[PDB]
Design a protein around this ligand. Structure first.
Ligand SMILES: O=C(O)[C@H]1O[C@@H](O[C@H]2[C@H](O)[C@H](O)[C@H](O[C@H]3[C@H](O)[C@H](O)[C@H](O[C@H]4[C@H](O)[C@H](O)[C@H](O[C@H]5[C@H](O)[C@H](O)[C@H](O)O[C@@H]5C(=O)O)O[C@@H]4C(=O)O)O[C@@H]3C(=O)O)O[C@@H]2C(=O)O)[C@@H](O)[C@@H](O)[C@@H]1O
Length: 230
């Protein structure tokens, strides 16, 4: 068998507060199964150090979903509880194979919709400007499908090396920090006030591929989910 992610220390904290959804939103592995060596080509320890996710198919996923720690059930939190909800990661996004067009690698999601997706995308025009092979944030400020429901931002061009992300939610404001630099500062999340079902996700969620067989692949050198009280 392939080497399991839980065979080293690095990812135990997040695995203790996650379930794995694969190849759909249906459960693939509970937190205890993840901590206890769940492994396959979709989810294995790569190069002795990376938690690697792989998935093919439109809207299929191999994704961690935030859980209450220590064997608990699904978590839900609010964007304005006065704490800071923080997701940190260090991600190697390799060159994606032909047919893969957008891969969501971190999210904030609720009972109804994704508040935030951080995704790699092959090609995209944003605000009249073309970008290629880059990392994007998509924030929902509404529940509809037209442009004004979203704020989409170029976060960084994709790099060969690891790229760090920090997602902070505090007092209905979102901050995104890439390689130590604040890119998105205080994006408003007030539309979501009253929602108590938000949670973090991370991994690989395959969006709008041109081929159903093309396999997205994303490597995490680090991932953590932490609520900071103030
Ligand atoms: O490309 C465009 O045309 C526009 O796309 C806009 O972004 C899109 C994305 O491309 C994706 O389509 C994205 O997909 C969302 C999807 O709409 C749902 O919200 C889905 O929800 C699932 C949850 O992630 C979660 O896995 C949930 O799990 C439940 C479930 O009951 C399950 O059975 C289990 O037992 O318990 C779990 C639980 O843990 O809570 O299931 C949900 C499900 O219905 O399957 O999540 C995906 C997602 O992961 O984000 O939607 C966005 C969008 O914003 O609508 C945007 O880029 C726009 O600019 C483009 O024009």
């Amino acid at each position: 068998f392939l080497t399991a992610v839980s065979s080293i220390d690095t990812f135990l904290p997040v695995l203790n507060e996650a379930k794995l959804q694969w190849p759909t939103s249906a459960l693939a592995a509970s937190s205890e199964e993840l901590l206890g060596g769940y492994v396959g080509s979709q989810f294995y320890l790569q190069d002795g150090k990376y938690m690697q996710f792989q998935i093919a198919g439109s809207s299929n996923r191999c994704e961690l979903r935030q859980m209450i720690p220590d064997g608990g059930s699904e978590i839900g939190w609010a964007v304005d509880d006065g704490t800071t909800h923080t997701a940190t990661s260090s991600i190697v996004v390799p060159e994606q194979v032909d047919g893969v067009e957008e891969v969501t690698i971190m999210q904030i999601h609720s009972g109804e919709a994704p508040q935030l997706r951080i995704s790699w995308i092959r090609s995209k025009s944003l605000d009249g400007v073309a970008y290629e092979d880059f990392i994007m944030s998509t924030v929902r400020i509404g529940t509809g499908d037209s442009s004004d429901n979203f704020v989409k931002t170029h976060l960084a061009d994709r790099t060969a090396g690891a790229m760090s992300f920090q997602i902070d939610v505090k007092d209905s404001k979102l901050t995104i920090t890439v390689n130590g630099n604040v890119v998105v500062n205080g994006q408003d999340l007030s539309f979501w006030d009253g929602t108590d079902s938000c949670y973090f996700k991370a991994g690989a969620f395959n969006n709008n591929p041109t081929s159903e067989s093309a396999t997205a692949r994303i490597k995490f050198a680090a991932l953590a989910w932490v609520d900071h009280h103030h």
